[PDB]
Amino acid sequence: KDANASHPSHSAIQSLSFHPSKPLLLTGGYDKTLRIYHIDGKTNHLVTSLHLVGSPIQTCTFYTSLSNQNQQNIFTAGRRRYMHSWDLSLTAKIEKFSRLYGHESTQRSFENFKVAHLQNSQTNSVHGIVLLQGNNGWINILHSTSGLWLMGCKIEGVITDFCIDYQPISRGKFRTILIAVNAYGEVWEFDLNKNGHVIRRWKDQGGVGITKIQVGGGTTTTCPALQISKI
Amino acid sequence: QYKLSVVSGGKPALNNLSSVTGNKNIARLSQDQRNYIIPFNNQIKVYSVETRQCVK
Amino acid sequence: DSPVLQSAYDPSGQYLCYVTVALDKQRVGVQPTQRATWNENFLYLEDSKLKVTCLKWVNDTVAIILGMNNGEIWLYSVLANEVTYKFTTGNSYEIKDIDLMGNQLWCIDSSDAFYQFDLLQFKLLQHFRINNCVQLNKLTIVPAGDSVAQLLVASHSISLIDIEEKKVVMTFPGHVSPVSTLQVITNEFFISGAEGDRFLNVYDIHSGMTKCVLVAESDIKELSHSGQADSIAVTTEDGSLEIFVDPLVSGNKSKKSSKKIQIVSKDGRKVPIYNAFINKDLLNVSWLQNATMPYFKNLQWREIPNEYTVEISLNWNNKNKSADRDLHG
Amino acid sequence: STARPRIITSKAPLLPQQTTPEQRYWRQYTSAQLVKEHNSVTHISFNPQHPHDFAVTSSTRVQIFSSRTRQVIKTFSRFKDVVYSASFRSDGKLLCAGDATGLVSVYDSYNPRTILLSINASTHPTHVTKFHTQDNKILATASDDRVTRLWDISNAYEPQLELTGATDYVRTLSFIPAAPHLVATGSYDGLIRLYDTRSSGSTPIYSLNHDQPVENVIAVSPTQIVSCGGNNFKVWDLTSNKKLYERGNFNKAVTCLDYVENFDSPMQSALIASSLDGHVKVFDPLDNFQVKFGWKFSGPVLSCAVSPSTAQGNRHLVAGLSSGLLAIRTKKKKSNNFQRMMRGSEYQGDQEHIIHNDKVRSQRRMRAFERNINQFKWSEALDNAFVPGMAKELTLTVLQELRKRGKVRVALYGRDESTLEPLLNWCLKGIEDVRSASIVADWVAVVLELYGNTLESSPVLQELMIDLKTKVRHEIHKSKEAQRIEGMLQLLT
Amino acid sequence: NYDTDFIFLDIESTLGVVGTNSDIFAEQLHKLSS
Amino acid sequence: MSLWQLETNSQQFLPRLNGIIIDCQVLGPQGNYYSLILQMTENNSNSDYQFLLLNASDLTSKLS
Amino acid sequence: GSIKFWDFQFATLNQSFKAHDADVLCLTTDTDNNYVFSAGVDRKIFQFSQNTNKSQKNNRWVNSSNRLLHGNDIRAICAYQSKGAD
Amino acid sequence: AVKDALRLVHLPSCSVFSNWPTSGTPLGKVTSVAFSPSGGLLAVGNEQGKVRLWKLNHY
RNA sequence: UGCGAAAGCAGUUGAAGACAAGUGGCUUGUCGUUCGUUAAAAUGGCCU
């Protein structure tokens, strides 16, 4: 059965994400509402539904932390200078991120974000980062709970898309790599568990107008790991 | 038939020491950080950060 | 249609066990019917096509027996979260109904076979099958103490069965469709109700004669009877509840419902009741508030009016009033 | 943390003769039109129903003007003598005009060529003709025959009722606005008679003694009516036969009245009065018929009217003068593929459970002095004060904000000759006013405290200080003589 | 205050006033589901 | 209350906090709260402190 | 006014500082590149330091200091560093 | 950009599945897509406002 | 500082010790020092 058949959408469905554990599907579009559906085979019903006024949404993501796997945030954002974060509690407590901590000129719209995990690498403490794709070549990485700007990674060209790769190192330590593509086809990989420094820079063979990069086969941002040893 | 009582609280009363800069805030968060334990000069207030009410 | 595939109360109506699908796999959860005395952990069926066909509360480590569709009765403790023991027949046939009396579990098969298991010994005691009963989908033990004689088996047509002779001793005219509820009321009566009809009939288990017919005003999903036959509450297809008060007295051959309860929200949206529970003066109704999470309500059903409309508070357009901010933002 | 409080504009204690809401509303009737008629405008009526046209009765023609272009849409010129009264029926469908030969002629409105019927009333001139306001098929015409007549417009041969009884020159009718059997007529002997039409009709049920010869009688409530004649107007409770207000706020005789109800206004009701000396005034019936606004015109005003209660468009006040001209003052009032792509932007949360709202409201734009005081650019805030296009209260409030807030001296530190001349050249103008002169005093005192050497060097602000000295000399003569007047009426307590 | 009491304010601001089977299953489930 | 990004020396401000900050500290495990003591020194006759934590996300006064 | 440090191989930015208020006309460094001094039309001289062992092992300049010494501009800056001259 | 433009390419073999989607799959103008982490289950959202749902029976 | 009214009316401004600079002393100046008396400045300014 069509998942949003129970409660129709009033716009084109711009983003779509499953929950990492629960049977929930979050849809959202330019009608500035976001809907969660308990999906099954027969009767995909609507769990809850939140209409953010004056804020059409373009990307919406279930985030679930690695430490306790008990937060269940929803980060959502559109063509705005803010990004909402709903804390799932089954009223609804949402917060708004609207401060680039000195970096507002290079981030004029919170549309293209991605959420990922990051490790402190002196403690074994992970925390979520949101990653915002900005104007020049910039990716502004900031904390997913405090909203503090952690670091920024600039590629040379027109930034078009990016993805997050993880690689394990030892027992309980992994490393986060940001993979960002020019429009022209040249790809930067930034190690960002340290300071956001480039470790590899390669070039796509062929390809001249590049719109979308993705990784897969392990833990992406859309197949997320529930436990840190499962990365 | 008249009786005196003290019924309502007072000042929060942090560390009133000299020679301690920084940590003079003796209020604590819980470990399951849902309620905030502040002393007063008359009592220990325990507020709750979710509902902003005093719960104990 | 309802996401809750199977659901049943414990005796005394204190907990509700319910099987719902969760993104192509069945999951079995238990909720307390009153919090004043969430439970966020489920039993997960790990196969995409293994599913629960029936479930029964045992009575004292508390457990559920879940009759699956691969010839197995799983026995699952609820305080822990594992199937403690896996009864199996020799076959792969789905099992249509189970029951137990004391420690003696009985079950029916899709090949119309009867199996008997012992919960104290974890063993298949008996396996048999009887003639002219060929589409069985309900059994009910007629209670006679620790003796577990006289099963009562339905196939659209109820048949009383002596197990020492493995033979049929009475034959009741059932329905025109498969029987969906078949429950013993007193030591001389049993109620039965079929799939897709709104007529229960109470039969006399000693003669075969139908005492009375009970008429819901919508197709009956589940029923509960209070433990002393004085009240029967059925829940129907349109999400309503109908209480027949004292149905076993002299509205002479067929009786209508005495009380009818439905739930609406503050809006006008009618939520459906599934699977209520009744006892002496106390009635506990269940619905789903969000998509699959059950909410309950206790009611003194003897002092409510006849046409009762429970009102629940449910989010429809409410402005998200944050506790850390006044109304002016 | 809060938002920043806005800079509050310095308001002084209010002076006398402030702008009332009534006179603000009645003062936005502007853009006067003067249309020269052939003779004195005697009557003017409005269309009731689509209340958007008005008929002006000049001599020997009646012109319907539109209430959106103010030009003559239609005109009625086939009268033999001076046409006197012209009013629309309550349905606004046809137009009656009494003529100086005693021939009431009723046309249909918006068609001057189809004269519908010509009632031949008295041989004397017929001076007032109006339909019933409740009934549709009866027309009341009074004439210089000292007798009014009610005519059924089906049987237009004999009058269906003949209201006599008045001794001299009946010039006005009126109908009572809830009881349709009740006709109040007014004549040049005073004595508003009024008649129950179910009775004989040759005797009034009672009579109201306006002492002057009345010029008009209108009905405000179903109970109270207002008669103007002579220098005053009086109001009369009709259930108790008794006068209860009289306003005589004119010099010459009040020629006409009319009344408005429920229209979009601070005034819930309004009676305006036109009075042969140039003045038309508006009186508010809810606070005891007190006058709230007035217009003065270029000659003796003979008749006036306003747009009716349901005007819904361009709203008019018209006054026709005895000089032979007409004065109108009005108040006025991408792709289907792209839209399918950008569909949802007008939804606003109807079927949705929770609806979150944290879009902050966009406040008024900050002026340059306010954002400079915010940015702590205090000398730039003083510079932004003394631009030419600044309001006087705005220069005063940024001076007062720099005075209270920080330092006059900080705002004045880096200055010289060319950058002090705006301040002192404004202080010349601000020293005259009472509300500014304390701030002007301490600002001039500080600038001569810390620029006493530039006084010596530059001669082209020496002369500015001398002009300021003569200004304070004039102002101190004024502030001394005000204390003398204060004493000389303290003597008279 | 306007209902026959008198409030007073201490110098350290304390306001004072002068006036006129299943049970163990329930317990262990509320433990194990929290 | 300013918070200095020590990489680029970049301040983020919170400007009108009804009292001078006599103590400030991060509080959570991830640092999601700031707790502050505000001395409110317009009256010189008493030392009256306001205790104000606030969530670090949108810098709103959670539980003053 | 921004001063940027770019990794030569990979030809890409490591970190950007928003230091001056107007143009940065001239900038220079010392021998062992523990400091970078910079100046321009807003007439302050900024110093960016990497002298800490953690700064050298992390490749992280910090905006250390800032001095206002000139009257109008700085159009030229240079550095000399020897055993008896720095 | 156009209607029904969705392909599922099998890999490591790098070969597009040739039996789905067909000409009668109501994919629409595919403006989002999502995979379930456990069930083996596609959600495909189009410009009409419809999430269509499919289950891959390998999982 | 005290009494006052928002005007005003009476009172002032010592000592010890340590340290710093300059030329063990002498001079000058300070004090997260004590006793007694009712007693201007580090280019450094306010969020989305």
Side-chain angles (χ1 to χ4, degrees), chain A, chain B, chain C, chain D, chain E residues 1-20 26, chain F, chain G, chain H:
Chain A
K1 175 140 168 287
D2 293 357
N4 74 315
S6 175
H7 198 146
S9 186
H10 286 73
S11 68
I13 285 175
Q14 299 292 327
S15 189
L16 196 58
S17 49
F18 279 98
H19 203 274
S21 63
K22 293 146 177 34
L24 270 45
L25 176 87
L26 170 75
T27 88
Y30 279 152
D31 62 332
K32 65 199 80 65
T33 175
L34 71 165
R35 304 175 174 86
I36 313 173
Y37 293 90
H38 180 282
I39 73 140
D40 48 352
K42 306 297 171 305
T43 55
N44 309 119
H45 269 110
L46 178 132
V47 174
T48 173
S49 173
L50 167 78
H51 177 93
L52 312 155
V53 306
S55 164
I57 72 171
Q58 157 76 53
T59 316
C60 46
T61 321
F62 274 119
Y63 166 78
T64 317
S65 79
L66 271 178
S67 71
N68 43 356
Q69 54 263 45
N70 276 130
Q71 265 84 14
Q72 288 89 20
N73 284 123
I74 289 182
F75 293 90
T76 177
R79 198 171 272 195
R80 288 300 184 273
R81 279 186 293 273
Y82 49 89
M83 157 179 44
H84 285 292
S85 177
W86 178 6
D87 180 28
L88 284 178
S89 50
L90 273 301
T91 174
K93 37 177 301 177
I94 84 165
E95 309 92 5
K96 183 201 279 193
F97 297 158
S98 43
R99 291 97 190 273
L100 287 311
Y101 279 65
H103 301 257
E104 286 104 344
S105 68
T106 182
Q107 180 74 211
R108 301 307 307 191
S109 157
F110 279 60
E111 280 171 345
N112 306 94
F113 75 99
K114 280 187 181 174
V115 194
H117 301 297
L118 191 64
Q119 191 138 36
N120 180 35
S121 71
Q122 65 263 12
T123 51
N124 293 14
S125 50
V126 296
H127 56 87
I129 45 175
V130 309
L131 287 87
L132 301 167
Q133 165 200 323
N135 48 12
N136 206 274
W138 280 99
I139 309 290
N140 295 305
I141 305 155
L142 60 93
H143 211 276
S144 89
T145 78
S146 39
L148 296 171
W149 184 90
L150 296 173
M151 75 203 92
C153 317
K154 176 185 216 303
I155 82 159
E156 270 321 297
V158 194
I159 174 71
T160 43
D161 211 271
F162 64 100
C163 80
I164 317 293
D165 195 11
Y166 310 86
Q167 56 174 48
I169 285 303
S170 73
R171 181 180 321 271
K173 287 164 182 308
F174 64 100
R175 151 202 298 194
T176 316
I177 295 100
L178 164 69
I179 295 171
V181 194
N182 204 346
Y184 167 60
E186 42 210 9
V187 184
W188 284 250
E189 291 184 352
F190 308 91
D191 200 1
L192 68 152
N193 75 325
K194 57 191 62 177
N195 297 289
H197 279 155
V198 194
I199 55 184
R200 203 202 165 191
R201 187 173 150 167
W202 52 279
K203 168 65 169 72
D204 168 46
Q205 172 188 92
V208 55
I210 297 299
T211 64
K212 207 74 55 172
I213 202 180
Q214 196 51 72
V215 282
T219 68
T220 73
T221 80
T222 319
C223 167
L226 294 91
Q227 187 207 338
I228 169 162
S229 44
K230 308 276 273 162
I231 274 167
Chain B
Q1 67 268 12
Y2 276 71
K3 42 195 69 53
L4 177 135
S5 300
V6 285
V7 294
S8 294
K11 45 174 66 188
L14 73 155
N15 277 326
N16 263 7
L17 293 95
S18 190
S19 82
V20 179
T21 195
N23 40 12
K24 36 177 62 76
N25 182 18
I26 45 188
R28 299 284 294 192
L29 259 180
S30 318
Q31 49 276 20
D32 164 77
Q33 38 175 46
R34 285 172 53 190
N35 39 6
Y36 190 69
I37 302 161
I38 173 179
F40 270 55
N41 65 334
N42 320 333
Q43 77 267 29
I44 294 276
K45 293 271 271 292
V46 178
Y47 287 81
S48 157
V49 291
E50 312 315 318
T51 78
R52 299 184 58 143
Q53 306 303 305
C54 195
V55 296
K56 189 56 189 313
Chain C
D1 203 71
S2 176
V4 173
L5 289 194
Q6 302 274 333
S7 80
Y9 281 85
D10 73 315
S12 65
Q14 210 180 349
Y15 308 102
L16 179 72
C17 165
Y18 70 111
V19 179
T20 77
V21 198
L23 188 131
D24 85 4
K25 292 174 200 283
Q26 302 282 99
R27 58 168 185 202
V28 191
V30 168
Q31 292 304 298
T33 71
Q34 164 53 263
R35 189 61 168 193
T37 56
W38 204 252
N39 178 30
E40 316 93 352
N41 43 359
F42 301 91
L43 169 65
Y44 268 103
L45 298 203
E46 72 270 60
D47 188 17
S48 174
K49 68 196 203 82
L50 177 67
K51 51 187 66 174
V52 180
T53 78
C54 69
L55 63 98
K56 181 73 56 186
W57 280 81
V58 312
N59 290 111
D60 276 326
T61 294
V62 59
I64 323 295
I65 38 175
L66 311 158
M68 301 286 176
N69 61 336
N70 56 340
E72 289 181 356
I73 295 99
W74 290 18
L75 200 148
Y76 151 74
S77 157
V78 292
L79 272 305
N81 257 336
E82 67 286 348
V83 45
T84 82
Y85 185 71
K86 212 150 298 185
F87 292 100
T88 174
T89 75
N91 296 318
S92 74
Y93 295 129
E94 76 156 58
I95 59 158
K96 304 272 182 194
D97 201 6
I98 66 192
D99 208 323
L100 52 78
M101 175 57 63
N103 75 306
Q104 200 160 310
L105 156 69
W106 278 87
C107 87
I108 207 70
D109 215 9
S110 73
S111 73
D112 319 306
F114 291 72
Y115 299 83
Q116 184 196 341
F117 301 94
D118 213 350
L119 296 202
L120 203 63
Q121 302 304 117
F122 307 96
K123 292 191 303 172
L124 197 150
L125 259 50
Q126 283 177 339
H127 156 261
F128 58 95
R129 63 186 57 162
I130 319 177
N131 283 329
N132 40 291
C133 42
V134 287
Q135 282 107 14
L136 316 172
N137 50 358
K138 291 294 171 184
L139 64 85
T140 295
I141 295 167
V142 188
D146 291 31
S147 41
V148 196
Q150 279 190 320
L151 298 171
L152 187 67
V153 192
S155 72
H156 71 61
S157 176
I158 311 109
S159 76
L160 186 51
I161 284 171
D162 187 40
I163 58 155
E164 277 96 314
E165 304 275 274
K166 305 178 186 195
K167 80 161 197 164
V168 167
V169 296
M170 262 175 243
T171 289
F172 304 88
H175 309 259
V176 310
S177 56
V179 183
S180 64
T181 61
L182 174 72
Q183 289 187 1
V184 170
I185 297 302
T186 71
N187 53 359
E188 74 256 4
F189 288 128
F190 67 98
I191 196 80
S192 71
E195 267 168 4
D197 79 313
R198 62 187 195 275
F199 282 71
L200 305 156
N201 47 7
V202 46
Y203 302 89
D204 177 89
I205 204 162
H206 281 139
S207 71
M209 287 271 313
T210 80
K211 181 190 188 60
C212 183
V213 183
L214 281 307
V215 183
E217 57 188 54
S218 199
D219 309 66
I220 280 151
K221 279 306 169 184
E222 318 266 341
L223 75 94
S224 196
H225 51 95
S226 42
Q228 54 269 11
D230 61 333
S231 182
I232 286 169
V234 311
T235 170
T236 74
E237 185 143 54
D238 56 343
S240 275
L241 192 77
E242 278 138 19
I243 310 178
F244 311 96
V245 191
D246 203 2
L248 268 60
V249 300
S250 64
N252 43 1
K253 281 185 280 194
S254 88
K255 303 206 170 53
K256 324 296 180 303
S257 70
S258 317
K259 301 190 181 302
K260 161 157 151 60
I261 303 155
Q262 78 263 20
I263 307 184
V264 305
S265 87
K266 303 298 214 67
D267 318 333
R269 290 194 268 129
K270 174 167 174 305
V271 304
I273 304 183
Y274 76 104
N275 199 13
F277 175 86
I278 207 169
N279 208 0
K280 54 186 75 63
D281 313 331
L282 175 80
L283 161 77
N284 176 81
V285 299
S286 171
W287 66 98
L288 303 161
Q289 190 80 271
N290 292 117
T292 65
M293 46 159 51
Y295 277 44
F296 306 95
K297 183 82 167 310
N298 275 132
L299 289 180
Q300 300 311 118
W301 63 267
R302 283 208 210 259
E303 58 186 1
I304 64 155
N306 292 143
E307 310 98 313
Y308 192 38
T309 305
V310 167
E311 281 264 356
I312 58 174
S313 43
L314 186 42
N315 308 147
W316 176 234
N317 261 344
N318 40 6
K319 319 284 159 282
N320 195 10
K321 176 61 180 307
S322 69
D324 295 25
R325 181 152 298 237
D326 80 316
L327 284 79
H328 290 224
Chain D
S1 178
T2 84
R4 206 198 265 103
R6 305 283 276 196
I7 294 308
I8 297 180
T9 288
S10 72
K11 198 180 292 185
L14 82 159
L15 263 43
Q17 296 314 111
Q18 77 263 4
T19 81
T20 60
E22 294 101 24
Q23 90 190 7
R24 178 191 318 269
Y25 170 68
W26 284 110
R27 93 183 180 195
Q28 58 178 340
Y29 277 71
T30 174
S31 49
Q33 273 199 1
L34 287 310
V35 190
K36 181 69 178 57
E37 294 294 318
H38 295 164
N39 208 314
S40 58
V41 171
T42 72
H43 285 263
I44 171 167
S45 175
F46 264 86
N47 211 18
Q49 269 313 302
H50 202 213
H52 73 315
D53 297 322
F54 55 98
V56 171
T57 308
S58 157
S59 87
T60 182
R61 62 170 180 163
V62 179
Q63 299 146 287
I64 298 175
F65 294 78
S66 88
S67 72
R68 56 185 68 245
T69 78
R70 307 191 275 178
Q71 272 76 247
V72 176
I73 46 168
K74 279 191 186 297
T75 172
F76 295 76
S77 64
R78 51 183 300 175
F79 299 96
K80 287 215 168 304
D81 209 292
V82 168
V83 55
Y84 274 122
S85 197
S87 69
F88 294 91
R89 204 168 79 163
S90 60
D91 62 352
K93 266 177 203 156
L94 67 167
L95 177 142
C96 76
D99 166 68
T101 60
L103 190 133
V104 189
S105 78
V106 46
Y107 304 78
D108 62 329
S109 42
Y110 319 121
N111 210 330
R113 290 322 204 280
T114 80
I115 164 164
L116 218 56
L117 55 99
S118 82
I119 280 158
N120 204 30
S122 53
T123 43
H124 284 94
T126 286
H127 267 270
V128 43
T129 42
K130 37 178 66 175
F131 293 93
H132 211 98
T133 44
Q134 282 84 29
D135 203 319
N136 274 280
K137 36 187 297 173
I138 46 177
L139 166 62
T141 84
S143 40
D144 289 357
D145 203 2
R146 317 182 330 247
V147 48
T148 87
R149 291 161 187 90
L150 310 182
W151 303 81
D152 198 290
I153 50 173
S154 321
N155 297 272
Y157 319 107
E158 57 102 21
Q160 90 162 4
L161 196 50
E162 209 156 357
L163 264 48
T164 180
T167 61
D168 170 46
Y169 272 10
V170 178
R171 286 293 165 86
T172 320
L173 280 309
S174 191
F175 297 97
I176 309 302
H181 58 104
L182 217 48
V183 176
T185 200
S187 47
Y188 277 179
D189 60 335
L191 269 295
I192 297 98
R193 284 105 181 154
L194 59 156
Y195 300 85
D196 195 8
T197 49
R198 277 93 42 93
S199 69
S200 83
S202 315
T203 55
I205 44 176
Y206 36 87
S207 314
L208 297 170
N209 186 22
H210 197 124
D211 193 27
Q212 279 96 343
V214 311
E215 304 266 346
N216 256 294
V217 44
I218 68 158
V220 168
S221 277
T223 64
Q224 67 190 20
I225 66 162
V226 182
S227 92
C228 83
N231 59 334
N232 45 50
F233 66 92
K234 303 160 180 168
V235 320
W236 312 85
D237 194 292
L238 212 73
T239 60
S240 69
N241 213 358
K242 184 177 150 303
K243 192 185 80 75
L244 70 157
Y245 294 111
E246 170 200 322
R247 301 279 102 91
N249 307 143
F250 311 94
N251 277 331
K252 301 179 179 187
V254 195
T255 46
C256 85
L257 305 168
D258 82 313
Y259 170 72
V260 214
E261 178 71 29
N262 274 326
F263 71 123
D264 284 324
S265 175
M267 228 184 281
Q268 214 270 344
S269 319
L271 184 135
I272 78 169
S274 174
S275 84
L276 255 193
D277 57 340
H279 276 117
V280 54
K281 302 186 185 295
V282 50
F283 296 78
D284 184 12
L286 275 307
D287 51 345
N288 310 122
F289 283 78
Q290 283 311 297
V291 58
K292 293 304 195 296
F293 193 78
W295 295 266
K296 178 84 175 185
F297 284 115
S298 62
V301 194
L302 216 65
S303 82
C304 82
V306 289
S307 295
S309 180
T310 58
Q312 94 185 13
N314 219 342
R315 206 173 266 280
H316 286 55
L317 182 140
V318 194
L321 314 188
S322 174
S323 174
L325 55 95
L326 204 163
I328 308 160
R329 315 184 75 87
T330 80
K331 74 167 290 192
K332 304 181 284 179
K333 302 208 77 158
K334 316 180 65 195
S335 312
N336 287 11
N337 291 358
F338 179 74
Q339 285 170 44
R340 206 158 47 235
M341 187 175 75
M342 307 272 120
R343 195 151 80 253
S345 158
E346 50 97 28
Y347 177 51
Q348 304 158 12
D350 273 328
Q351 280 72 233
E352 267 58 23
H353 290 190
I354 313 169
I355 296 155
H356 190 80
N357 194 341
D358 44 2
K359 300 288 287 267
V360 75
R361 277 211 185 279
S362 65
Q363 42 188 356
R364 200 194 39 87
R365 187 208 274 100
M366 266 181 297
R367 295 173 175 268
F369 74 95
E370 179 158 11
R371 70 172 184 87
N372 284 293
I373 287 177
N374 286 2
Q375 294 282 333
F376 316 105
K377 323 285 199 46
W378 291 358
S379 63
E380 284 96 308
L382 202 56
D383 279 352
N384 284 280
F386 300 130
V387 312
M390 194 62 60
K392 305 207 174 64
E393 60 266 68
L394 291 193
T395 46
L396 182 69
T397 190
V398 55
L399 282 187
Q400 288 202 327
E401 278 286 340
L402 289 176
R403 170 181 167 275
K404 146 192 74 182
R405 175 166 314 263
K407 208 188 209 212
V408 187
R409 325 199 180 273
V410 159
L412 287 172
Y413 268 156
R415 309 302 176 92
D416 43 357
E417 192 270 320
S418 86
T419 70
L420 278 180
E421 193 265 319
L423 183 133
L424 281 306
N425 219 27
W426 185 86
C427 278
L428 298 196
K429 278 86 189 172
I431 204 53
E432 300 154 343
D433 199 285
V434 174
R435 312 164 266 219
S436 46
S438 176
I439 312 297
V440 176
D442 69 81
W443 273 82
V444 174
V446 166
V447 66
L448 57 88
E449 180 208 318
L450 90 164
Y451 287 97
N453 219 56
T454 310
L455 289 186
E456 173 273 349
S457 71
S458 157
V460 304
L461 51 83
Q462 298 184 151
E463 56 90 19
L464 206 46
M465 295 305 243
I466 295 166
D467 215 346
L468 194 37
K469 173 65 183 174
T470 73
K471 285 293 186 190
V472 190
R473 195 48 78 197
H474 293 346
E475 296 293 286
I476 203 174
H477 159 60
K478 291 218 287 193
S479 202
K480 275 190 297 196
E481 73 166 355
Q483 185 61 73
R484 308 212 206 102
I485 310 291
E486 205 270 348
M488 91 192 274
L489 97 168
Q490 186 76 20
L491 163 67
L492 260 50
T493 293
Chain E
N1 50 296
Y2 295 80
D3 44 358
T4 50
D5 315 281
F6 322 121
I7 318 156
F8 55 90
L9 174 64
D10 177 21
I11 205 179
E12 308 149 332
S13 310
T14 81
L15 299 157
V17 69
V18 282
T20 61
Chain F
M1 174 197 70
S2 94
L3 64 157
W4 301 76
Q5 178 171 298
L6 258 56
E7 314 288 335
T8 59
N9 313 63
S10 186
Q11 305 96 20
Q12 181 72 220
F13 294 118
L14 195 65
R16 274 93 63 188
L17 284 182
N18 49 58
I20 60 172
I21 296 97
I22 64 159
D23 172 41
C24 59
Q25 54 161 348
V26 297
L27 212 58
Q30 300 304 321
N32 43 0
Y33 300 113
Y34 308 137
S35 43
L36 265 59
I37 309 180
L38 303 163
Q39 216 262 333
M40 212 173 323
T41 175
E42 50 255 52
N43 61 327
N44 41 2
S45 90
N46 201 7
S47 71
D48 35 5
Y49 312 89
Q50 168 150 353
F51 278 50
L52 185 145
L53 77 159
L54 70 159
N55 65 324
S57 58
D58 53 13
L59 264 73
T60 48
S61 77
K62 180 168 308 300
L63 192 72
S64 159
Chain G
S2 73
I3 292 163
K4 292 145 170 311
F5 297 91
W6 317 76
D7 199 13
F8 191 91
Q9 69 152 353
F10 309 129
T12 178
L13 184 140
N14 293 351
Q15 53 190 351
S16 173
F17 298 91
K18 190 175 288 208
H20 297 70
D21 283 28
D23 318 351
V24 187
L25 296 180
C26 52
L27 48 88
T28 189
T29 179
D30 65 321
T31 322
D32 271 330
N33 303 285
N34 297 334
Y35 307 96
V36 164
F37 299 90
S38 76
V41 52
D42 78 312
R43 89 200 214 199
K44 282 194 283 184
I45 298 187
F46 276 73
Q47 164 201 49
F48 293 82
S49 89
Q50 211 191 60
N51 44 27
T52 297
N53 201 294
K54 207 189 72 169
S55 294
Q56 287 196 4
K57 80 153 170 287
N58 290 165
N59 207 328
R60 300 305 279 179
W61 305 87
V62 307
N63 183 11
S64 170
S65 294
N66 179 20
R67 286 192 99 166
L68 181 57
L69 301 171
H70 285 255
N72 204 295
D73 272 10
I74 295 101
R75 298 214 173 189
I77 198 170
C78 71
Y80 190 64
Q81 197 178 6
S82 275
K83 195 164 266 287
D86 56 349
Chain H
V2 310
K3 265 202 199 312
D4 299 328
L6 183 134
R7 306 283 179 259
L8 303 203
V9 41
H10 176 270
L11 44 86
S13 93
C14 303
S15 59
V16 161
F17 286 115
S18 69
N19 75 314
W20 195 83
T22 71
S23 52
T25 52
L27 283 176
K29 189 183 284 286
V30 183
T31 174
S32 180
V33 74
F35 264 118
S36 157
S38 165
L41 196 148
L42 273 172
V44 171
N46 44 29
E47 203 195 14
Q48 317 198 48
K50 292 156 194 322
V51 168
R52 266 76 193 253
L53 204 82
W54 283 274
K55 174 176 169 60
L56 288 95
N57 288 315
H58 186 69
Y59 307 95

